Amino acid sequence: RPCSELLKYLTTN
Amino acid sequence: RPCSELLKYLTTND
Amino acid sequence: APVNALVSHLLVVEPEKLYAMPPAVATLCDLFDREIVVTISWAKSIPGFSSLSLSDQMSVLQSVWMEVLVLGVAQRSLPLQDELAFAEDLVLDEEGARAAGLGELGAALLQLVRRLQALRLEREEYVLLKALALANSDSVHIEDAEAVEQLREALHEALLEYEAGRARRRAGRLLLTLPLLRQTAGKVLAHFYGVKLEGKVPMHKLFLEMLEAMMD
Amino acid sequence: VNALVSHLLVVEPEKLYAMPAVATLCDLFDREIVVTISWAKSIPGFSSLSLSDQMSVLQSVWMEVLVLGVAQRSLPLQDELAFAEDLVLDEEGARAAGLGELGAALLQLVRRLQALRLEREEYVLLKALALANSDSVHIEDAEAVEQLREALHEALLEYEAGERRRAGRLLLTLPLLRQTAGKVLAHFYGVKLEGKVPMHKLFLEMLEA
């Protein structure tokens, strides 16, 4: 489930 | 690109 | 009683049921080879295809044969649940595709099946979508691009006229499954090209040649 | 005028500008991924999807959105690819820039779209449709993604109704869009396997996703 980088933008401004 | 078999079936009016 | 000439003809030239009989991967390789032969005579029967130059007929078939075969596997699997009907007498589930030595293909194929099941694909729509996939080839080798486009437009028009009488319009929903059909075909080709390179499974010349062609 | 169409026009990203060869593209694509993410969240119905479904969709269609942008930008030109308003390279330089033959694959998509003289409104609807047509096996609420797909589909039909004929010709280009995105992915995935060319975290993550 390599997706930490993507999550960072999905849960921001 | 080899196409021998394809050609055979395409041109065999059968 | 319907009235669309193209739809009727397409229904008439549909190939008869396929039987794997009466080793896993080896059986599939042999089956696919026979399916290719059937796809070739089927294409030649399509009003508009045989009028294409011989070289363009080859170019089109070399780039879309796998999509045609894959759509056939999906169509046969529609009445099943989580299963793939490669042939009437050869059905496998995801776990079954595993052992057979198909790897991830089981899951890829089922995504397509489920996508078509959601639509409740009718026989008329299936033959039209299959012919459409053939006519929607994007092979760089096609010389008379306009003639192929004329064929595609004729089939597209026949689909619209058909929906306009029976069955977010319906035609578009069917067309939106084509990207997956092509992507699924690409995966099946990659896998079998792999089976070819591993050199452990006997494969017929036609199948080998077509695998190398649609691979370019 | 269609409500959804106007919204898509509003949230449409601003023109892109360039920031070695392969190196610049890897960085340019990394930024576009960021723009794509914000763009998606702006679409009516995307945000209603669970977080994981939002991830699954973006992870499986981000390259199509990108490739489609390149093509849209290359429409006015001939035999040329505009990866940015200030970054254009002929099919020759594409090879020189170390891009294998993606240039030819890309131009093939460009020519298919040029033949249809894609209008602005059709471009945005098609791009949104591509996002909503994800076939990610990881999606959980397939009925929801579908609902979003149909809303956009309806918008396209209403728009063309100025329909199904023109609408379908547009949809018939999607298989090529996906296949083209697939080739771009495989190329750059190998570009990170060479290690020589540098590239951000996001882009690297999205490539392996």
Neighbour-count burial of C21, counting CB atoms closer than 10 A to its CB (0-12 exposed, 13-18 middle, 19+ buried): exposed
- Rounded-to-integer distance, Cα C135 and Cα C60, Å: 8
In what helix (H) or strand (E) does residue B5 lie, and over which residues does it extend?
helix B4-11
Using DSSP, state whether C90 is helix, strand or coil.
strand
D34 touches chain A (CB under 8 A): yes
Which of C127, C114, C125, C126 lies closest to C184, judged by CA?
Answer: C114
- Rounded-to-integer distance, Cα D41 and Cα D49, Å: 10
Which of D127, D23, D130, D129 lies closest to D83, judged by CA?
Answer: D23
In this structure, the strands spanning D87-90 and C83-87 are unpaired
Residues of chain C found within 8 Å of residue D177, distances taken between Cβ atoms: 179
Residues of chain C found within 8 Å of residue B3, distances taken between Cβ atoms: 58, 62, 209, 213
Alpha carbon D107 to its chain's center: 14
| Partner residue facing B7 (CB), from C41, C58, C205 | C58
CB–CB contact B2 C54 (8 Å): no
Range list of H helices, chain C = 5-12, 24-44, 54-77, 94-97, 105-119, 123-135, 145-163, 170-175, 178-197, 205-213
Three-state SS string over chain D comes to: CCHHHHHHHHCCCCCCCCCCCHHHHHHHHHHHHHHHHHHHHHCCCCCCCCHHHHHHHHHHHHHHHHHHHHHHHHCCCCCEEEEECCEEEEHHHHHHCCCCCHHHHHHHHHHHHHCCCCCHHHHHHHHHHHHHCCCCCCCCCHHHHHHHHHHHHHHHHHHHCCCHHHHHHHHCCHHHHHHHHHHHHHHHHHHHHCCCCCCCHHHHHHHHC
- Rounded-to-integer distance, Cα C103 and Cα C101, Å: 6
- Rounded-to-integer distance, Cα D157 and Cα D164, Å: 6
CB D8 within 8 Å of CB D128? yes
How close, in Å, is residue C47 to chain D by CA atoms?
Answer: 20
- 């578009």: which residue's tokens? C172
Please tell me what DSSP assigns to residue C85: E
- Rounded-to-integer distance, Cα D10 and Cα C35, Å: 49
Please tell me what DSSP assigns to residue C165: T
Cis amide leading into C202 (omega within 30): no
- 């193209």: which residue's tokens? C6
Which residue(s) pair with D84 in the sheet? Answer: D87
The encoded tokens of residue C155 equal 């089939």
Name the phi and psi angles at C132, rounded to 5.
-65, -40
- Rounded-to-integer distance, Cα D126 and Cα D170, Å: 7
Neighbour-count burial of C197, counting CB atoms closer than 10 A to its CB (0-12 exposed, 13-18 middle, 19+ buried): exposed
List the domains of chain C with CATH numbers: 1-216 (1.10.565.10)
Which of D118, D152, D158 lies closest to D132, judged by CA?
Answer: D152
| Partner residue facing C111 (CB), from D104, D137, D156 | D137
CB C63 within 8 Å of CB C101? no
| Partner residue facing B1 (CB), from C54, C57, C213 | C213
- Rounded-to-integer distance, Cα C35 and Cα C31, Å: 6
In what helix (H) or strand (E) does residue A8 lie, and over which residues does it extend?
helix A4-10
Please tell me what DSSP assigns to residue C14: P
- Rounded-to-integer distance, Cα C115 and Cα D80, Å: 36
In this structure, the strands spanning C90-93 and C83-87 are antiparallel
Name the phi and psi angles at B2, rounded to 5.
-55, 140
In what helix (H) or strand (E) does residue B6 lie, and over which residues does it extend?
helix B4-11
